[PDB]
């Protein structure tokens, strides 16, 4: 059964600015997501140093970029640390609140949207290119969840019955109609090269 939650007003605010503002340099969504994955692989790797059994849900620490033209999706998968239900519903909301206010103040000082990751709310750049985002995630301590928002002030969470994923986070981008350049192999390659060349984990770009 699906639970529907309201975003705190400040996150709603941020998701609308990202959606409504004219800002043509949308491609940074991809370095933000890949950074987010890089951060989650670091946390699982570190944890596993003092508790090797934390890697029983999978030994490989890696990033996969999967485009799907027929579904119009670009999916970013990592086998990072994952998100618990509390993360999805309470924790990330709390943190994103003060990063949003800083990111908000910064813009009314002449910062721009590409700097969104310095404020720990990188994830929301997904709304530059996606009309809907679905996040499948599995943490060691909790069940597998599906989270979802087309923005407009609310999100849902359900327990996920799909393919079990071991441990990590899949971020599925349902791309806006004018944004299908990010399904193209040479375009994704160009962005990873330009913005993500030094990520400490293999990034595999799947072909269609």
Ligand X SMILES: COC(=O)c1c(-c2ccno2)n[nH]c1C
Q: Is 141 annotated as a binding residue?
A: no
Helix (H) or strand (E) holding 203: strand 203-205
Residue 124 binds to a copy of itself (criterion: CB under 8 A) = no
Report how far residue 139's alpha carbon sits from residue 120's, in angstroms, rounded to the nearest whole number.
20
Is 83:44 a contact under the CB 8 Å cutoff? Answer: no
Q: Is 68 annotated as a binding residue?
A: no
Report how far residue 77's alpha carbon sits from residue 105's, in angstroms, rounded to the nearest whole number.
32
The residue number whose beta carbon is nearest to Mg ion equals: 93
> Site for Mg ion (CB under 5 A): which residue of 58, 93, 120, 153?
93
Residue 11 binds to Mg ion (criterion: CB under 5 A) = yes
> Site for a copy of itself (CB under 8 A): which residue of 118, 154, 159, 204?
118
Taking alpha carbons only, the member of 75, 69, 67 closest to residue 177 is: 69
Report how far residue 190's alpha carbon sits from residue 192's, in angstroms, rounded to the nearest whole number.
6
Pick out residues in 97-156 that bind ligand X (CB under 6 A): 121, 123, 135, 147
Report how far residue 84's alpha carbon sits from residue 72's, in angstroms, rounded to the nearest whole number.
28
Is 83:165 a contact under the CB 8 Å cutoff? Answer: no
Residue 188 binds to ligand X (criterion: CB under 6 A) = no
53 binds, among a copy of itself, Mg ion, ligand X, none (CB under 5 to 8 A by kind): none
Residue 171 binds to ligand X (criterion: CB under 6 A) = yes
Pick out residues in 6-35 that bind ligand X (CB under 6 A): none
Report how far residue 114's alpha carbon sits from residue 122's, in angstroms, rounded to the nearest whole number.
9
Residue 8 binds to Mg ion (criterion: CB under 5 A) = yes
User: Which residues are annotated as part of the binding site for ATP?
Assistant: 36, 78, 97, 123
Note the residues at the interface with ligand X (CB under 6 A): 36, 88, 92, 96, 121, 123, 135, 147, 169, 171
């Amino acid at each position: 059964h699906v639970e529907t939650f309201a975003f705190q007003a400040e996150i709603a605010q941020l998701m609308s600015l990202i959606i409504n503002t004219f800002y043509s340099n949308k491609e940074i969504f991809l370095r933000e997501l890949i950074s987010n994955s890089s951060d989650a692989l670091d946390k699982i790797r570190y944890e596993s140093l003092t508790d090797p059994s934390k890697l029983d849900s999978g030994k490989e620490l890696h990033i996969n970029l999967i485009p799907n033209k027929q579904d119009r999706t670009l999916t970013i998968v990592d086998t990072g640390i994952g998100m618990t239900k509390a993360d999805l519903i309470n924790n990330l909301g709390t943190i994103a609140k003060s990063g949003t206010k800083a990111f908000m103040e910064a813009l009314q000082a002449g910062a721009d949207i590409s700097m969104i990751g310095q404020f720990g709310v990188g994830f929301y750049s997904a709304y530059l290119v996606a009309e809907k985002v679905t996040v499948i995630t599995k943490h060691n301590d909790d069940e597998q969840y599906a989270w979802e928002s087309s923005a407009g002030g609310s999100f849902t969470v359900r327990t996920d019955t799909g393919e079990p994923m071991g441990r990590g986070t899949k971020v599925i981008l349902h791309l806006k109609e004018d944004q299908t350049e990010y399904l193209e192999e040479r375009r994704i390659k160009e962005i990873v090269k330009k913005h993500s060349q030094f990520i400490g984990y293999p990034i595999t770009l799947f072909v269609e």
